[PDB]
Scaffold this active site. Structure first.
Site, PDB file in Angstrom:
ATOM      1  N   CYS A 111       0.951  -1.058   0.028  1.00  0.00           N
ATOM      2  CA  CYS A 111      -0.188  -0.083   0.083  1.00  0.00           C
ATOM      3  C   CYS A 111       1.124   1.305   0.004  1.00  0.00           C
ATOM      4  CB  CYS A 111      -0.869   0.144   1.319  1.00  0.00           C
ATOM      5  SG  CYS A 111      -2.462   1.126   1.310  1.00  0.00           S
ATOM      6  N   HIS A 154      -9.100  -4.408  -2.923  1.00  0.00           N
ATOM      7  CA  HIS A 154      -8.047  -3.548  -2.024  1.00  0.00           C
ATOM      8  C   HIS A 154      -8.475  -2.120  -1.936  1.00  0.00           C
ATOM      9  CE1 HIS A 154      -3.938  -2.817  -0.394  1.00  0.00           C
ATOM     10  NE2 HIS A 154      -4.267  -1.557  -1.029  1.00  0.00           N
ATOM     11  N   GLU A 155      -8.686  -1.380  -3.160  1.00  0.00           N
ATOM     12  CA  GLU A 155      -9.062  -0.289  -3.436  1.00  0.00           C
ATOM     13  C   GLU A 155     -10.362   0.025  -2.705  1.00  0.00           C
ATOM     14  OE1 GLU A 155      -6.911   2.335  -3.461  1.00  0.00           O
ATOM     15  OE2 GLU A 155      -5.354   0.663  -3.795  1.00  0.00           O
ATOM     16  N   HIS A 158     -10.478   0.564   0.863  1.00  0.00           N
ATOM     17  CA  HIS A 158     -10.283   1.957   1.369  1.00  0.00           C
ATOM     18  C   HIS A 158     -11.289   2.801   1.646  1.00  0.00           C
ATOM     19  CE1 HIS A 158      -5.793   1.968   1.544  1.00  0.00           C
ATOM     20  NE2 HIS A 158      -5.749   1.630   0.564  1.00  0.00           N
TER      21      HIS A 158
END
Ligand code: K3U
Ligand code: NI
Ligand code: NI
Length: 183
Positions: A111, A154-155, A158
């Site tokens: 990251c 993953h994004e 966020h």
């Protein structure tokens, strides 16, 4: 252009917030930042431009990571063998369905917002379907498996204040789940 100066770092409160859905159409300002986020990825993947401006390489970026708490992401994953590449700027992305079958990168994840490397497997859905909007408010439905699916998850995490390392087993970080596939 965005640089590592723009990327907020682990510990920053904005990373732990839930990002707000955008109203459509987007403002001229919101389009500009979403293009800039994509431009960061492109730039970070060019050997020369990345040396010059001190860029870490990335394949995805969520607006929270530049301290904008809005539900938009960018993903740039180059060809890498198969003839498949992923170049997407998404507004209000949502995972609407997925596989039961988990998958994982065997080296863990990184990251941009995390200065240290963290060891640990991050188990994720091997397949996902995403509904989102593009930059002009048109409708996008994505069906993803494997590396692309990990990246988008993953994004998307966020946007919900979740960091990759939250998914790592504190006791047995490198132990795969049974039937989880290695990507
Ligand atoms: O590993 C990366 C980039 S790391 C990355 O994209 C971060 C996230 C990531 C997702 C999935 C696996 C590993 C890292 C992005 C972040 F920090 F902005 F969210 C790579 C870049 C170019 C060529 C080959 C590999
Ligand atoms: Ni990240
Ligand atoms: Ni576990």
């Amino acid at each position: 252009m965005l640089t590592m100066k723009d990327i907020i770092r682990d510990g920053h409160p904005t990373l732990r917030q839930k990002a707000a859905e955008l109203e459509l159409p987007l403002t001229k300002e919101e389009k500009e930042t979403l293009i800039a986020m994509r431009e960061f990825l492109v730039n970070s993947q060019d050997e020369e431009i990345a040396k010059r401006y001190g860029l870490r390489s990335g394949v995805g970026l969520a607006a929270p990571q530049i301290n904008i708490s809005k539900r938009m992401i960018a993903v740039l994953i180059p060809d890498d063998g198969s003839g498949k590449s992923y170049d997407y700027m998404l507004v209000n992305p949502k995972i609407v369905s997925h596989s039961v079958q988990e998958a994982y990168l065997p080296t863990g994840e990184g990251c941009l917002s995390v200065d240290d490397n963290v060891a640990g497997l991050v188990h994720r859905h091997n397949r996902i379907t995403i509904k989102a909007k593009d930059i002009e408010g048109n409708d996008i439905q994505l069906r993803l498996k494997g590396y692309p699916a990990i990246v988008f998850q993953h994004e998307i995490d966020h946007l919900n204040g979740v960091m990759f390392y939250d998914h790592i087993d504190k006791n047995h970080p490198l132990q795969p789940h049974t039937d989880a596939v290695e990507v």
